[PDB]
Amino acid sequence: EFKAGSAKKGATLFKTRCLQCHTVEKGGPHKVGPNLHGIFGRHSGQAEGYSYTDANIKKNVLWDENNMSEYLTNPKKYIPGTKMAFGGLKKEKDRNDLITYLKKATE
Amino acid sequence: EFKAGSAKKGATLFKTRCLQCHTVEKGGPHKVGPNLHGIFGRHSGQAEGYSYTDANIKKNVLWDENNMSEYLTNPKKYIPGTKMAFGGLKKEKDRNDLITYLKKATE
Ligand SMILES: O=C(O)COc1c2cc(S(=O)(=O)O)cc1Cc1cc(S(=O)(=O)O)cc(c1OCC(=O)O)Cc1cc(S(=O)(=O)O)cc(c1OCC(=O)O)Cc1cc(S(=O)(=O)O)cc(c1OCC(=O)O)C2
Ligand SMILES: O=C(O)COc1c2cc(S(=O)(=O)O)cc1Cc1cc(S(=O)(=O)O)cc(c1OCC(=O)O)Cc1cc(S(=O)(=O)O)cc(c1OCC(=O)O)Cc1cc(S(=O)(=O)O)cc(c1OCC(=O)O)C2
Ligand code: HEC
Ligand code: HEC
Ligand code: NA
């Protein structure tokens, strides 16, 4: 259950928990993970130029703040077979802050 | 203006005229030019993870078989300021064959 949080705290969390694998800006490069520009409102496995697992593509989830909060809690449970090596953001406050930043940064 | 041609001949033309800068398959990499999967029915300058010119983004053309054929005839004339260093496919039969292949390969 998503609730708007602190984009400032979320930016700091993104720099330590996500930035190593993902960029957010339009035209930002794909790295270990896909560039996340426009992720909200895009179906999973649809960023062109990125080699996804069939698991991520087949899940075909339409990304929204609410299902992304469920996904980021435990990625392997959400998408069994995903190659995103991320254990999960277990604190609701952290997910709210990170997703608030992500929505602003990927717009 | 587009008329269905030979996808077999189009595949060979893609190899000699496009492949040096582009891939077509789902998950294929961005190179000098963006990966072209899902190009038809998408607006120009929208493949994630690729850094386009402002010219290509501003053009905001919804790609279809006809405007693709005009574009490929003379890219710099259709999108002034584009960084696609391609003189153009001047032959109608070559554009028809290539687009017939692209319609299949990018979908
Ligand atoms: O227990 C649990 O079920 C939950 O564990 C946590 C997770 C997320 C958060 S949280 O978002 O609220 O913060 C907090 C904890 C609890 C915890 C807190 C801290 S600490 O107090 O903050 O120092 C340090 C460690 C922690 O785990 C204690 C333990 O394991 O007993 C020990 C550690 C440190 C580091 S490391 O420093 O980043 O390299 C990495 C891992 C760690 O786990 C080692 C282990 O597995 O063996 C692996 C791991 C990575 C990630 S990431 O990929 O999403 O980053 C998320 C989780 C991870 O655990 C996977 C797993 O549990 O299966 C899930
Ligand atoms: O056969 C027909 O009845 C009529 O075919 C044409 C001719 C002249 C003109 S035209 O002057 O108005 O242009 C236009 C066409 C129709 C056509 C147009 C275009 S296109 O839309 O304009 O691109 C492309 C091709 C064309 O032929 C479609 C097809 O073959 O089914 C495919 C092609 C491309 C090229 S290429 O320019 O070197 O790349 C070369 C040839 C091609 O044809 C063979 C193939 O591909 O195997 C060989 C050929 C050369 C010459 S030249 O040396 O005397 O000029 C004249 C003709 C030729 O074809 C002879 C042959 O068939 O027997 C006759
Ligand atoms: C590298 C070790 C990563 C870290 C750290 C995080 N992500 Fe990731 N992510 C990574 C990969 C390799 C993939 C593709 C997975 C696949 O199975 O193909 C992803 C994917 C995502 C997605 C889905 C993107 C899509 O287009 O469907 C999202 C929404 C995502 N990652 C978000 C994300 C965030 C917010 C992270 C920090 C909290 C994060 N990822 C860390 C690799 C890595
Ligand atoms: C390198 C020398 C290229 C060759 C050869 C071809 N293309 Fe290209 N293409 C290239 C670049 C650098 C760009 C981006 C242009 C920009 O101004 O940002 C492109 C772009 C395209 C596009 C538009 C893609 C979009 O998402 O809007 C298309 C449809 C395209 N290119 C098609 C294409 C084909 C079919 C070619 C062979 C005939 C071809 N390109 C060659 C670089 C290069
Ligand atoms: Na742990």
Curated annotation (Swiss-Prot), chains A, B:
InterPro entries: Cyt_c-like_dom, Cyt_c-like_dom_sf, Cyt_c_1A/1B. It comes from the Eukaryota. This is Cytochrome c isoform 1. Belongs to the cytochrome c family. It is found in: Mitochondrion intermembrane space. Heme c binds at C18, C21, H22, M84. Keywords: Electron transport, Heme, Iron, Metal-binding, Methylation, Mitochondrion, Respiratory chain, Transport. GO terms for cellular component: mitochondrial intermembrane space; mitochondrion. GO terms for biological process: mitochondrial electron transport, cytochrome c to oxygen; mitochondrial electron transport, ubiquinol to cytochrome c. Present with 7330 molecules/cell in log phase SD medium. Methylation may enhance its transport into mitochondria. Methylation occurs in fungi, plants, and some protozoa, but not in animals. The precise role of methylation at Lys-77 is unknown, but it seems to preclude pro-apoptotic activity, possibly by lowering affinity for APAF1. One of its GO terms (molecular function) is cardiolipin binding. It comes from Saccharomyces cerevisiae (strain ATCC 204508 / S288c). Binds 1 heme c group covalently per subunit. The gene is CYC1.
